[PDB]
Ligand binder design. Structure first.
Ligand SMILES: [Mg+2]
Ligand SMILES: [Mg+2]
Ligand SMILES: [Mg+2]
Ligand SMILES: [Mg+2]
Ligand SMILES: [Mg+2]
Ligand SMILES: [Mg+2]
Ligand SMILES: [Mg+2]
Ligand SMILES: [Mg+2]
Ligand SMILES: [Mg+2]
Lengths: 88, 218, 129
RNA sequence: GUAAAGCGCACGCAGGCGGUUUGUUAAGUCAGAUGUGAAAUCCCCGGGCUCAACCUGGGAACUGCAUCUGAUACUGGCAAGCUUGAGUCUCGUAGAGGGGGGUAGAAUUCCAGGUGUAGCGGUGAAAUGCGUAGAGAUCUGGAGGAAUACCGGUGGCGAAGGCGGCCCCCUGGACGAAGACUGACGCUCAGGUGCGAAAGCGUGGGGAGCAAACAGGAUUAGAUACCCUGGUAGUCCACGCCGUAAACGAUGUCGACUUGGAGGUUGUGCCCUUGAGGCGUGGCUUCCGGAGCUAACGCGUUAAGUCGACCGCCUGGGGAGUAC
């Protein structure tokens, strides 16, 4: 999946504080990680469809996370996108 | 409850979710009947039993099984009670009209041996027809005298006697039987959650009901 | 997923009844209580309790008359994705009267009879007969 | 499920549905009232032509729309939460899950040489065929492609198709455990997007074995077959296309309930485990079977039982999944 190091690292850079892995923001971040890192792996092989399934899931899951955030706090949503350069 | 402490549970681990409300535990990989509520059962049974048993209550003790067999006879034969311990004929209760016909044949067959009405035909025939009485006195013997369905019946185990019971409740005849784990209570209307075997266990309640029944005759 | 908690409660009872189960349990909620109450006031269930503090439970005891169960039939009516509202002069008559129809009125969750008399209509919930 | 009928399978926008608590609102909803809903029909009661048909007085009804005044249980909106739904983190567990690259051994075939000599191969027999130009058998050396005995299973993993030697790298999912965190972020999904056995198609490779086509031999009345001797496509590879199958459990997905028995597989708490073991407790999975369901066969806690949310589909046979 993801490296424990980078995992914990990104946990604070967005976590509401410390060791609070679960925040709508935290998740999105942890998601975009593998989401972007996988592309590098997918750029190659390409025919690894079965692994794509996972990639796509996290992709859609992320959208469902952001969509929610924006609904529960337009603030964090607009700010979160920036630190990740998401939303086009 | 006294002598009741001589049978406890029975059957390894096959039971039946229907006997649950009567099971105590299962020490040593074996279900143990809840005798703590078994004796109380005896009341409703032994009560209603002697009740109708008063007016020459036609009681039918059933115990086709081996163990109880040799015993079941004495019990019912200790008063105006009848018994059946040899392969319950198919319909000897419901199809009585037809079954009784065999009884009559048996009756007259006895008279044959009774007086000089036996010494007839070649030894072959005599020896031939004699065999007939043998089995007949087994499958219909302990019931030869009972013109008409019994007022009730007390079957040993509700399992091995599935056929017998099936007819009883069909003729609207109250059923009294000892059920346990593997047994199916949905049949008998008077649940007697107790060991379905154990030479001692069977004789224990066998005569027990016999007495109350014979005693109920004033 | 639980898109209809009311249905669960109802089904829980009928399923239990036929199962001879002594009593039934489930997560309580304002509405569930009101229904369970009417079910008791009408003589369909022995009683009912609500255990738990932070997590509400609902000790609903079933009732069995003779060698049979009291609730011979209980089905949901005004279910989700298809609501049902009637008028004072519309309330259905369960089992020609021998039955009851729990209807939520602006005055509370009462039985069809009561509602019809109070002159107010509401939302049906089930037809316990 | 087998009668017509579950998209081959997933992700998911619109749409439909939405755990739990308090407050608030009052839109749906309920109540009251006010407009209006033409008269005639219809309906009830009552009249008038001798009766009836017919005519007529009154009421009812017009199941509807709008306004106003309330009621607030439920649904909807809003506010603040909550944690059991869903998800996140930590640590493990098993796995023929997927993509890429290596590599080993058994065998077949082919090439070369040795030994050796009249058969071999095949069938029901045969025959075609291969053999004295020396086969077959036997041994040595080499080339090459494809597939991985045993383990292996009532087995495992995957959404489905499907995935078996061993090794490395990249990668997806599932499960348990203690717990820690977010706080309804959920379920379903027309259209859409993507995945899709085999056969087939395009380009360029590869080609041992097997084999549509094709050619012989045999069989038969015939034999455009089955059988035998050969053998091209293809089967293999890379990339692209084709989207079908009895794509089947002929059974859509998610969730909650409802007696049992025996077994497989994988995780885990606890107990002199002295030894395996015993008390359990999650995930996945076989077989039998109760209630109930079923036209029956049968299904049966992995339901085809009892219920809820959403979806797809059926409406007599042939013509025809055909024509346009
Ligand atoms: Mg067919
Ligand atoms: Mg069909
Ligand atoms: Mg399918
Ligand atoms: Mg009018
Ligand atoms: Mg509300
Ligand atoms: Mg192919
Ligand atoms: Mg090709
Ligand atoms: Mg599986
Ligand atoms: Mg079965």
């Amino acid at each position: 999946s993801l490296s424990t190091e980078a995992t914990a690292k990104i946990v604070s850079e967005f976590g509401r504080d410390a060791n609070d892995t679960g925040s709508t923001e935290v998740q999105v971040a942890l998601l975009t990680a593998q989401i972007n890192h996988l592309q590098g792996h997918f750029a190659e092989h390409k025919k690894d469809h079965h692994s794509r399934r996972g990639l796509l899931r996290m992709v859609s899951q992320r959208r469902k996370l952001l969509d929610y955030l924006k609904r529960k706090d337009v603030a964090r949503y607009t700010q979160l996108i920036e630190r990740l350069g998401l939303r086009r | 409850m006294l002598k009741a402490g001589v049978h406890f549970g029975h059957q390894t681990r096959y039971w039946n979710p229907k006997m649950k409300p009567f099971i105590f535990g299962a020490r040593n990989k074996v279900h143990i009947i809840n005798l703590e509520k078994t004796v109380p059962m005896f009341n409703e049974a032994l009560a209603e039993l002697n009740k109708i048993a008063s007016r020459k209550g036609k009681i039918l003790f059933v115990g086709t099984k081996r163990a109880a067999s040799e015993a079941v006879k004495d019990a019912a034969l200790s008063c105006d009670q009848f018994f059946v311990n040899h392969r319950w004929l198919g319909g000897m209760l419901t199809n009585w009209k037809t079954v009784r016909q065999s009884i009559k044949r048996l009756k007259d067959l006895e008279t044959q041996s009774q007086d000089g009405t036996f010494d007839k035909l070649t030894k072959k025939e005599a020896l031939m027809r004699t065999r007939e009485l043998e089995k007949l006195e087994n499958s219909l013997g302990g019931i030869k005298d009972m013109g008409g369905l019994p007022d009730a019946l007390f079957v040993i185990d509700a399992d091995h006697e599935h056929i017998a019971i099936k007819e009883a409740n069909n003729l609207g005849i109250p059923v009294f039987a000892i059920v346990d784990t593997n047994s199916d209570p949905d049949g008998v209307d008077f649940v007697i959650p107790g060991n379905d075997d154990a030479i001692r266990a069977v004789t224990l309640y066998l005569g027990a009901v016999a007495a109350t029944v014979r005693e109920g005759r004033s | 997923s639980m898109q209809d908690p009311i249905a669960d409660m109802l089904t829980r009872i009928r399923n239990g009844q036929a199962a001879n189960k002594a009593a039934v349990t489930m997560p309580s909620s304002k509405l569930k209580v009101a229904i369970a109450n009417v079910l008791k006031e009408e003589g369909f269930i022995e009683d009912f309790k609500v255990e738990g503090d932070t997590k509400p439970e609902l000790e609903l005891t079933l009732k069995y008359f003779q060698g049979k169960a009291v609730v011979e039939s209980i089905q949901r009516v005004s279910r989700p994705g298809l609501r049902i509202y009637k008028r004072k002069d519309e309330l259905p008559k369960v089992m020609a009267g021998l039955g009851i129809a729990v209807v939520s009125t602006s005055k509370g969750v009462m039985t069809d009879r009561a509602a019809r008399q109070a002159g107010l209509g509401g939302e049906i919930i089930c037809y316990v007969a």
